[PDB]
Enzyme design. Sequence first.
Site, short mmCIF file in Angstrom:
data_model
loop_
_atom_site.label_atom_id
_atom_site.label_comp_id
_atom_site.label_asym_id
_atom_site.label_seq_id
_atom_site.Cartn_x
_atom_site.Cartn_y
_atom_site.Cartn_z
N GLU A 1 8.84 -4.83 -27.50
CA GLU A 1 9.75 -3.92 -28.19
C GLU A 1 9.06 -2.61 -28.56
O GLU A 1 9.71 -1.56 -28.62
CB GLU A 1 10.35 -4.59 -29.43
CG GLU A 1 11.13 -5.88 -29.16
CD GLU A 1 12.48 -5.67 -28.48
OE1 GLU A 1 12.97 -4.52 -28.43
OE2 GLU A 1 13.05 -6.67 -28.00
N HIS B 1 25.45 -12.87 -21.32
CA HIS B 1 25.62 -11.59 -20.64
C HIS B 1 26.92 -11.52 -19.85
O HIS B 1 27.59 -10.48 -19.82
CB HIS B 1 24.42 -11.33 -19.73
CG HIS B 1 23.11 -11.32 -20.45
ND1 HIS B 1 22.38 -12.47 -20.67
CD2 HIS B 1 22.41 -10.31 -21.02
CE1 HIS B 1 21.28 -12.16 -21.33
NE2 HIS B 1 21.28 -10.86 -21.56
#
Lengths: 198, 596
Positions: free
Chosen positions: B357, B487
Site C-alpha cells: 500500500e 469482484h
Amino acid sequence: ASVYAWNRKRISNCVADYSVLYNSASFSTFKCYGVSPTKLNDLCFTNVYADSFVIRGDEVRQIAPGQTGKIADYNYKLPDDFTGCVIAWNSNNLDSKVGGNYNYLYRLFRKSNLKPFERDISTEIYQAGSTPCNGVEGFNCYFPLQSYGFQPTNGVGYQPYRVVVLSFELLHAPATVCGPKKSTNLVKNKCVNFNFNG
Amino acid sequence: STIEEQAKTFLDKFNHEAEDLFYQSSLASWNYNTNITEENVQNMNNAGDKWSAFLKEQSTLAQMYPLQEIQNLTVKLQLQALQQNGSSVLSEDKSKRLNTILNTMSTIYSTGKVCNPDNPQECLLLEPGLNEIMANSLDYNERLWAWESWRSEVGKQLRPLYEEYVVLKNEMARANHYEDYGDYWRGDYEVNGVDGYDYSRGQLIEDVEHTFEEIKPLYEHLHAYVRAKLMNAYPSYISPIGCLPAHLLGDMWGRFWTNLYSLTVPFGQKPNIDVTDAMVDQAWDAQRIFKEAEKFFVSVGLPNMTQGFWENSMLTDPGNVQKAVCHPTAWDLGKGDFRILMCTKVTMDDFLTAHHEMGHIQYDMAYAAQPFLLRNGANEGFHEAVGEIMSLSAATPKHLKSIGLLSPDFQEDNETEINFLLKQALTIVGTLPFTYMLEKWRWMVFKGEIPKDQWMKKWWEMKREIVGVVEPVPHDETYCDPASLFHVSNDYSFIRYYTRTLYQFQFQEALCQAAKHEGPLHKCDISNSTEAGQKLFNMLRLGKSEPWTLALENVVGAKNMNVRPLLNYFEPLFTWLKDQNKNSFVGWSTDWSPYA
Ligand SMILES: *[C@@H]1O[C@H](CO)[C@@H](O)[C@H](O)[C@H]1NC(C)=O
Ligand SMILES: *[C@@H]1O[C@H](CO)[C@@H](O)[C@H](O)[C@H]1NC(C)=O
Ligand SMILES: *[C@@H]1O[C@H](CO)[C@@H](O)[C@H](O)[C@H]1NC(C)=O
Ligand SMILES: *[C@@H]1O[C@H](CO)[C@@H](O)[C@H](O)[C@H]1NC(C)=O
Ligand SMILES: *[C@@H]1O[C@H](CO)[C@@H](O)[C@H](O)[C@H]1NC(C)=O
Ligand SMILES: *[C@@H]1O[C@H](CO)[C@@H](O)[C@H](O)[C@H]1NC(C)=O
C-alpha cells in the site's frame, strides 16, 4: 488579498529594518532577485512596493522573473529586470478551515499575458470561442475567477502560502526608505574616528 | 479560437473544478470508511451524487468538441476519458434498474449469512466466519457443506439478477459502440494514435492465450504436486488421474492456494522464515512498520511520506466504539492528500501489505504533477504491479536481515528457497488459470458465445479444461457459482490480476537488472539502488499521460506483456517440481473420475 486583486502598499518615509525579516524562522521562502539580503540593511531606496497575496504551495516557484504559469501569465507578472525580494510562508493554520476556505480567488483565463506589476480585477466572461458570450457562462465561455480550495489536511504543495513581494526602485527623487543607522556607544577623551550624521 | 485551444481551456476548467469536488467526495468516502455511521453514509451518498452529476454535465459539455481535430496526445487522452457516456447513454428506467441491481448485489454479497439447515439459531458471514473454516478445516464434508450451502443461497439469489445484469451491461456497451461489455473492459488497454505502440482490444485475448500456453506446463506440474499432497491429506477422495475437488483448495472460491502451504510443504523439518516472533519480541508497532517501509523507499531513492500522511492516516484499529472497514486501502484523496487505511497487526502479511500500500501511495504521489484526469495508472495492471514488486522485494530474507528482523546466522540453503518459491507459486501462479478461465468465461457470456441455458455446463467444462478443478456434485442453471466472488458481483474487471502478475515479474527483472543483482531472481532486493528507483520513477512520473506499451518500453524494453520473467523466477522450483513428479502423473483428466 486574492492573487488576482493583490494588495499593493507603498512604503515611504521610514526606516526599513530588513534583518528582522531575514533572521526570522517563520518564512519558508526569502528569495531575493537583483540584490543580496546582507546589504539591504545598509542601502537606501526611494520607495518600497509591498505586494501581498495568497497562492498555493506549488505556485510559489512561479513568483520569479522569467517564469511561466497561470499566476505569472494571468494573475501576477514580475519583470525580468526586477530588483527586490520574494518572501513566502505557509499559512495553513490561518487560511484553512475544516469546511474549506473558498475566500481566495485567482484569474484562470485571459486573452493575453499580464504586463509587469499589473492588477486585473475585471470580471468579464472569457471568450474562448467564436460565439459571443453575451455575459452568461455557457459553452466556450467561462468565468475567469475561480476559488481556491484550502483545507488543513492538504499537502504542502496545496497548502495556502502568503506571499509578500518587495520591489525596490531608485528614482531621481530623494531616497527616503533607508536602512537602519547603526550606532555604537560614545567614547570621550580619546583620539577616535567619529561619524556623526554623515 | 481553434477547437484544440477551446478543449484545452475546457479541460483546465474541468481539472480545477473536478479536483476540489473529487477531494470533497474522497474526504466523505474516507470519513465513511474510518467511521461507519449513518450520517457519514448520507454525506458519502450526497457527495457521490454531486460528483456523478458534475461528471455527467462535464461529459455533456465535452462531447461538443470532436476528437479528430486535436493532435496533442495528452489533450486527446483527457477528452477521450471525459467523452465516455458511461451509463448515461442508457435510458433512465434501465439505468435506474442497473443501479438498483448493482446496489442489491452489493447488499446480498455484504450481508449474506448462511448456516446449516436444522441448526438456524446462529449463522456465519463470509468474512471471517466462512473464510476461517475454508482456510483451516481438514474435514471433507464440513467444507463440502459450507461450499454447497453458500453457493446454493448466493447463486439462487443472484442468478436472475446476473441474467438481468448481463443484458443491461451488453445494452449499455453496444449503445457505447462496443461489441460487448467484455470489449468495454478490454478498452482499458486500447492504445490508438501512437505510431508503433498501438494496441487493439482483440490483441489482448490473443496475448493472454499466448502467455497462458507457456504458463500451462508449470501449472500442470504444480497441480500434480498439489494433487499428490491433497491425496496424502485426504486419502480416498482424490483420484490420481482426475481433477481436484473444488472445496479443498484452501479458499472459498479457489482464488488463492496460499492456505495449502501447511499441507503441501516440501521440507517441514526445515525452519520457516517467519519474522512475526522477532517483531513481537522487539515490540514493533505498526508505526515502526511504516517507518521501516519509508526507510526502504528512501533507500531506493523515492520520496518519503508527507506530514499529512503521518497526521491523517489510520494505521491501527480504532477500537470498539468506532467502526472501520478492515480491508487495507491506500487513498489518493486529491490535492496532495495521501492516506493509508489499514488495520495493521504484527504479522508478516500486514508488513508486506504495508509495503504494497505504500507502493500504491508512492505511485499516487509520482503523478501528482499530471493533470487531474490523467492521474491514474497507464493501465489497471501497473497500479497493482508497483505494489506487488514492493511485496516481492520486502519478502526476501536479505531484506529481513538488512532491517534486523531475521537472524544473521540463518542458513539459506536450497530447501528453504524451494519451499518459499512454492509458497509464492501457490499465492501467485495458482491464481493465473482461475483468473484466465473466469475472464474468458465472462467474455464469452458477454459476447453471446454461451447461451443462458448453457452457462454452467460450459463453465465446469472450462474449469476442468483450464483450472483442473472438478465440481463435487453437478450444478444446474438455478445456481450462479461465479457471482459468489466480490469482484464479479460488484462490477469489477478481473484481468488486472493476470496483467499485474506478469508485469510484477517483468518489473522485478528490470529493477534487478538495474540494481546489478548477480544471483537468482527471487534472491534479489532492490534496496540501496538509486538507479533502480530512477528507472521506476521514469515510468511512475508519467501516470496516464503515456501509453502502457511505451511505459513498458521505458522499464523493460519490450512493447508487449511477456511471460518469460515469471518462468525465470520459478525455474529452480520448476526443476524441483519436474524431479518430484516422476512417479506421479502430470496433467489431469476432464472426466468424473475423482467424484461427481
Ligand atoms: C466517529 O463517529 C463518532 C460518532 O459519529 C464520533 O463520536 C467520533 O468522534 C468519530 N471519530 C473520529 C475520529 O472523529
Ligand atoms: C500538450 O498539452 C500540454 C498541456 O496542455 C503541453 O504541456 C504539451 O507540451 C502539449 N504537447 C504538444 C505536443 O503540443
Ligand atoms: C454519447 O451518447 C450520445 C447520445 O447518443 C452520442 O451522441 C455520443 O456520440 C456518445 N459518445 C461517444 C463517445 O460515443
Ligand atoms: C522527508 O525528507 C526530507 C528531506 O530528506 C526531510 O526534510 C523531511 O523531514 C522528511 N519527512 C519526514 C516526515 O521526516
Ligand atoms: C540441495 O543441494 C544438495 C547438494 O547439492 C542436494 O543433495 C539436494 O538434493 C538439494 N535439494 C534441493 C531441494 O534442491
Ligand atoms: C542500505 O542502506 C541502509 C542505510 O545505511 C543500511 O542500513 C543497509 O544496511 C543498506 N543495505 C545493505 C544491504 O547493506
